[PDB]
Design a protein around this ligand. Structure first.
Ligand SMILES: CCCCCC/C=C\CCCCCCCCCC(=O)O
Length: 133
């Protein structure tokens, strides 16, 4: 299952191409300006086979709970209602969100003890690096 090295609290330390990623999602300018300033913490926890990913920031908080391989309904930070799934691939925790015939992926992987989130929508690739805190 998911590595126990994911469990705990993570702080954003770098974000590359997030504005274009949000644009691809249809997020408007005022929201993007606050999203570009946000430096969230992400808390990953697990109870039995249920994994929770909680994001906290001044602007927006989110939380998802899921079992690997089991599709669920999600509310995203920008207020999309998606059909989502999280699965593993080579230890990467990979999320897909679907809605209105569109798709985005967020792949969260451990790299030298950091957590790297690769976020893809259309041709846009955004990379967000987190330190464990
Ligand atoms: C919730 C805190 C960050 C987002 C703040 C701006 C709010 C809405 C715009 C849409 C953002 C959707 C992506 C959120 C980030 C996913 C990748 C990650 O966990 O780093």
């Amino acid at each position: 299952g998911m590595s126990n090295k994911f469990l705990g609290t993570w702080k954003l330390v770098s974000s590359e191409n997030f504005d274009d990623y949000m644009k691809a999602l249809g997020v408007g300018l005022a929201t993007r300006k606050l999203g570009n300033l946000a430096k969230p913490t992400v808390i990953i926890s697990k109870k039995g086979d249920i994994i929770t990913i909680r994001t906290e920031s001044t602007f927006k908080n989110t939380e998802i709970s899921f079992k690997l391989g089991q599709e669920f309904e999600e509310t995203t930070a920008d207020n999309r209602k998606t059909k989502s799934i999280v699965t593993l691939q080579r230890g990467s925790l990979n999320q897909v969100q679907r809605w209105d015939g569109k798709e985005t992926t967020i792949k969260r992987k451990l790299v030298n003890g950091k957590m790297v989130a690769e976020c893809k929508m259309k041709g846009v690739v955004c990379t967000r690096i987190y330190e464990k805190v």
